[PDB]
Amino acid sequence: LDKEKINKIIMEATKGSRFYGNELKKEKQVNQRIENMMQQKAQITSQQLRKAQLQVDRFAMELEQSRNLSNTIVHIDMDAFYAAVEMRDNPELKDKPIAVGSMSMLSTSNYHARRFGVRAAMPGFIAKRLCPQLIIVPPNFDKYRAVSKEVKEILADYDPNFMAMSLDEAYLNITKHLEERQNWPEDKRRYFIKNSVVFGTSAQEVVKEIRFRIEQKTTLTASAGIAPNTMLAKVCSDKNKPNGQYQILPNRQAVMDFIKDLPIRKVSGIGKVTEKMLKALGIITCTELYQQRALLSLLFSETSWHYFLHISLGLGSTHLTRDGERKSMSVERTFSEINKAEEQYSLCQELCSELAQDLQKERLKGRTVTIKLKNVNFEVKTRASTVSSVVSTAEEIFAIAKELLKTEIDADFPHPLRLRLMGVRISSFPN
Template identity: 65%
Template sequence: MATGGTSSSSEEGFLSRMALNDNKAGMEGLNRDKINKIIMESSKGSRFYENELKKEQQVNQRIERMMLQKAHITEQQLSKAQAQVEKMTSDLERGRDLSRVIVHVDMDAFYAAVETRDCPDLMDKPMAVGSMSMLSTSNYHARKFGVRAAMPGFIAKKLCPNLVIVPTNFDKYRAVSAEVREVFADYDPHFLPMSLDEAYLDISDHLEQRRGWPETDLVYLSPSLSLVEEHGDLQETVEVEGLSPVLFENSPSSSPCLQDAAGGEVEVFGTCAEEAVREMRFRIEQKTSLTASAGIAPNMMLAKVCSDKNKPNGQYKLSSNRQAVIDFIQDLPVRKVSGIGKVTEKMLGALGITSCSHLGQEMALLALLFSETSWHHFLHISMGLGSTHIERDGERKSMSTERTFGEMSALKEQFSLCRELCQDLAQDLQKEALKGKTVTLKLKNVNFEVKTRAWTLPCAVATTEELFAVAKDLLKTEIDNVSPQPLRLRLMGVRVSSFASADDKKPLQKSIVGFLHKKQTNSSSTSQISHKPVKEHLPKPPGLTQPSACPSLVQQRQGQEGHAWVPSRGGVEVGRTGEDQQSFLQRAHAQSLRLQAEREDPPEKGDWNDSLTCPVCFREVNTTELTVFNRHIDQCLSGVTMGQNNHTDTELERGPSSTTGLLLYETSTANIPLSAVGLNPVCLNTCPNGGVSIHRGTDPNTLKGSSQSDPHVRDCLLSTGGPRPMTTPKPESRDHRGPALTCPVCQETQDTNDLTLFNLHVDLCLNQEVLHELGGLAPVDRTTHTAPPAAHKGLCFRDVLFTE
């Protein structure tokens, strides 16, 4: 007895899953029992039947667990859940937005209507678009027999033996959809298309503008009429012709508004929301000879429901007040709401919930039985709440393509189809300028078992070959898993996700290869830049508009050159406008680019491809192999190459007046504390030339002569934990230490390879303007105040006297 009851329950449950879903326009008043019986008889014994039966059993098990959980819920738990629901309801009510006017437009039997328009012989026949395996849509004549979308064609043939099935033609549908979207864009440029035949629009802004339009902007004629304005009169030129094909019973042969135009003059639309939507539908019919239905409501969820109220070729408006929304939602079946499918409908039905009003009454129970996301969604539905913000350009998470077919088990066909899918997906990615790191292969076998396999790559991919290389390996893995049996498929799809963001697309740092290559400069262009008239360097007046493209750094530098710096009282700079109002780092970088362009010699033609420059010894290494090049750098860093040079050491033998360093400005009497600029030299010592020597972290071998003979320097180094005296032999030439480093700010060559000294010099260069601003001094152009190179060899800064 128990077994029979279980079987009966399973059969009833299966019927509910396989039963016809008549929650669609044009399917009211059908004989459901007869249709469901035909569906059952046609499906029994098929793999689809077995798969649906297995899914139904899984759903029944979920319901059993849910009912068992419900039996253990206490009154205290219900009270606590009810308090939580009431608090959230109060918060949602305070945030209810009824100010927007959202429209959902849905074309009537779109694919079927396009085929009927192009083939009038189908107008009075039940027809569907698709194949014997699956239908995409059906016209309203076929819906009277229970034929609908997502139904196998062979079952539809048993429901309606005279059904005409037309193959799909998506190129044609996309072309018509583009025409419809042109009309949408006139009412909301940021409309949200959901598919080829439906979209959401926010016409709130359009209605504000519409109220100020003259009546002439609200007048429309059919394509066979021309609007001729002559002395203020509208003249009729050609008779009116019917537009819309007969897609359903009682469909008018032409638009009602065109009948008025034929009888008199033209159709004039109003300025309210209903009139704006009627005008939109009128224009769609004029442009495509197809009809559309629309729903008008305060949010997207309600607009979707409203668009189905007066289908086909109609519209419905829900007033934007709370009571109207609550009254509308009370008796609405839960299955009518987008997002509630047959599984959720059955689980709610087991709790006695069939309408949206029941959702509100049992919300505390739902909060205990369903996930937080689910019961929050149910609460929004019970209150008639939905999104009021149409976001078309939201962040895309993935992009995919898939194809359903008859049984396919040949390896050659499977790999060929995989490549075709990758090619189609690569084209879609190219259109959207997207690249992704994760490639997923979706497979459905003949038993309707779905498997997905994904692989995440270290870099983003987008081309056909890149996608196919990954998808092919994933497909091989599945083939090997079922070996020696063949992999029998009926669906295959490829998806790309983990898209690279805008920041990821930009390299975080320059490639080491690009950095080590010598930069090629155009000497002619450099010469042209340097000889431009001064007036071209002056910044434009603030009133003039700047070009859309960002100016180059060289252009920014030119704008700075032509504007003089005038010191004023208190050390405040005056006379700086426009592009001169930049940070010091921006100006310093522009200045370094200018100096580099003026001083850098063009490299040899073969240097770019045949050699790399060592960042340690700055020599050309005749190789493009990074392994060889890295080995050379390792040798330089370990000191292997320091004894291989035989240059003279005349440049090391310099007098006291040529200590190594950089000359910033002329000697000033302004005493600026080091702490004011963030500098804290360990030791300051007066140099013979009147400047100040800075010895923090200095390698003794980089100073004049032998630093061991200078007790002051030696004490500084030892007290600060700096480098200890080196025991290596005394170098014979300057090249033993490697070529000098060049400051990226002032472009002056520094006769040292000690990075501590070099970094200190760069810090001072970067802070020189700050020092002068604090001291009330006018900055001085380095190109006119630098001493000869021979005087820059020491670590002496004669420009500013630092005091601690």
């Protein structure tokens, strides 16, 4: 299927559903938010824009002066991870279009099935209309966890303080390693195939070794990115995916050459909404982002344009922080419609128990309890409450969540809440 035929079959299958109704409503809110930004832009004066331009350029020189090119950052990202695992252990599936998930939702798909536009976050029933030859295999999460542990073992040789972002992806600072490796004999860079082979002393070679070892240990491919910071490393890893790598060399000119025509969307942190908004201001590439830096310092908050300027100058993190403590724990579940109040309370109680059990594992306690409610028209509400002393037992959490749910049931009386999902989250942990 082709880029126009895809959107035709989706639109055909999605039209008139309650989900679509709610999506239209979400698109209007984004359009309005854009139109408001345009009304803001109309009433900026050339005088303000000049006083901004100076302010921004003073900061841009503060950033530029601190630019660091002396660290080598690698980002590893596995290819079609879940699907690739499922292909590995069932040969029948190879050379065929597959997705891991259910008819309600797909975690991922293999590259074969991606050619038909079936992707992560797509419901299976839509994916079947795009490609009736699609095989949908259920997830085996504990397997993926096991494979992930195999790759993290390899990664730990190259950076003991590597930063796992997910089961399938990670960041490494291979600076201390590259330095040691310059003066290494061939013995310490030699690996046998499962007839031996050696890898060179360069960064491109280190990452060829890593990828090789991953493929030998797991029978799966990864892609990778090499660059002087995390932001850039992450974008390169996507460039030659699947089963390739890319380096931006540590000199200012190569950074800027890469950035020049880079669509802002490929940056991690810029999603669909920020894309559309910035598109409306004639911003699509990272150079265009640099050009509008003054305008952006007026239309967006300090934190936002600070971020945008970092991107426009190809800057990013050059050291990896240890993974900080979690700030919240939550559980939520989608189901066939529940409208009877008594069943809704019981569901909330059950969610409160599950969450209490999960908190017990990490010995966590919190002061804020939030419930989450999605009705059959996909409209989501959250209702929270914060308490003086920390809580953690199923009873305590339910004591709070129960009242938040009562309030919502009462508010619609005599109409019943017709919900398709319910969640409970706990937050406000101690320090």
